[PDB]
Ligand binder design. Structure first.
Ligand SMILES: Nc1nc2c(ncn2[C@@H]2O[C@H](COP(=O)(O)OP(=O)(O)O)[C@@H](O)[C@H]2O)c(=O)[nH]1
Ligand SMILES: [Mg+2]
Lengths: 331, 27, 98
């Protein structure tokens, strides 16, 4: 468990925050939000919870991600979770969080394949995290089922747009492997909001369920559909493994064995897997935080130059100075 | 006037400290 | 007929999706024509494009017959009983698995 790529950046944020708080001002540390776009049952929730490093989201066959859960990670001194609709309660166990999320979804949408545009706001405080926004959006579908209205397709798409047309957002586009990449909706959306690939990261899931004799070797090499940041393959837990309470360590070991043994992927083994995605996102955040330094320097330099002309005289103030008095008199 | 002087000097030193920290953070 | 796609590849024009539908509409919107809607089993049925088209041109289900073509590749731990029994997305003529 855990995510150790945060540890090397947290003290940088703290030091910058302290440097600005010294003057009664904040730091414009506008880190990008992370939005996970995907088709229904593409695996977009298991990827997200593998980036956080905690097993707390509901996942599984069927329509589970019924509401647009928004997770806020706030750096703190201890570890706890809270909900805006459960104000005053404290959650010390992620299993309770998962069960409460399910109960809150059912309470509003019912037991059919319902949806609700209103998000759930879950905030987790921990000394090991950064101030991040994570958005788990409901998967897109083509036809209504259950008691959904005829426009279910358009309501879901509209829920996505308000979160991915915003600047400073990473579109983490998840598509299954045992399907044809040309028919992945997540990539159609990315091309509608990021016409040139600067933020979009491709992730290919379900590589272990490919039809025997076929592989995706020409997809992972960024040949079929060029994407500025390529595609990162991952292997998540299967439905049997979720129901079997499979450990996370075993899943990572199985993923590593899969890539090391597969005849068509050995040469890419060091470019794929869960920990590689963690490094890519952490590197993306680090590149962002460094890119803003010229603005902070220019603001501070301008303020310093503005005050210096008067500081030069204030620093020379003395309780007894007949020349200072005379200068003021003449002026 | 005394209060304005004191605030200007405090802000001056704090801004100098902020630059001395940011430059070291960038490395 | 050629299958529907969302993302153009291989120098296909950006409107490849609309040209494919235009070809499809000239055969499935005709009367006295049966439509067989082919959907994979490994991909969630709510995503099926064939059912969307059949639903648009045969709201009543008189002509549409559904088929589930890839039961061999189901993810271990799941099955499609709730589709083949015409419960998840009831279709007048049911579904045939192959
Ligand atoms: N073996 C395997 N199972 C997967 C993969 N991706 C998703 N699944 C399974 O698909 C089911 C639904 O995944 P889920 O993430 O809940 O879909 P979503 O939450 O609707 O995006 C779960 O049983 C997952 O374990 C994969 O890459 N490999
Ligand atoms: Mg999903």
């Amino acid at each position: 468990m855990g995510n150790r790529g945060m540890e090397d950046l947290i003290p940088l944020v703290n030091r910058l925050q302290d440097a600005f708080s010294a003057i009664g001002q904040n730091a414009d540390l506008d880190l990008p939000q992370i939005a996970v776009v995907g088709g229904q049952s593409a695996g977009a929730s298991s990827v997200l919870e593998n980036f956080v490093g905690r097993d707390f989201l509901p996942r599984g066959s069927g329509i589970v991600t019924r509401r647009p859960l928004v997770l806020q990670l706030v750096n703190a001194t201890t570890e706890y979770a809270e909900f805006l609709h459960c104000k005053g309660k404290k959650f010390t166990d992620f299993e309770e969080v998962r069960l409460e999320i399910e109960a809150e979804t059912d309470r509003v949408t019912g037991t059919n394949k319902g949806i609700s545009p209103v998000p759930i706001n879950l905030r987790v405080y921990s000394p090991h995290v950064l101030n991040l926004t994570l958005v788990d959006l409901p998967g897109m579908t083509k036809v209504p089922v259950g008691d959904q209205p005829p426009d279910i397709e358009f309501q879901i798409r509209d829920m996505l747009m308000q979160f991915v047309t915003k600047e400073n957002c990473l579109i983490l586009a998840v598509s299954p492997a045992n399907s044809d990449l040309a028919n992945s909706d997540a990539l159609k959306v990315a091309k509608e909001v990021d016409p040139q690939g600067q933020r979009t990261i491709g992730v290919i899931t379900k590589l272990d369920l490919m039809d025997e004799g076929t592989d995706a070797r020409d997809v992972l090499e960024n040949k079929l559909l060029p994407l500025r940041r390529g595609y990162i393959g991952v292997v998540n837990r299967s439905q049997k493994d979720i129901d079997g309470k499979k450990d996370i360590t075993a899943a990572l070991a199985a993923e590593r064995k899969f890539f090391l043994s597969h005849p068509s992927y050995r040469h890419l083994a060091d470019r794929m897997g869960t920990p590689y995605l963690q490094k890519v996102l952490n590197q993306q955040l680090t590149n962002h935080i460094r890119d803003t330094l010229p603005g902070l320097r220019n603001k501070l330099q301008s303020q310093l130059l503005s005050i210096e002309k008067e500081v030069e005289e204030y620093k020379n103030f003395r309780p007894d100075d007949p020349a200072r008095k005379t200068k003021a008199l003449l002026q | 006037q005394a209060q304005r002087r004191d605030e200007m000097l405090r802000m001056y030193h704090a801004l100098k400290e902020a630059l001395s920290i940011i430059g070291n953070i960038n490395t």
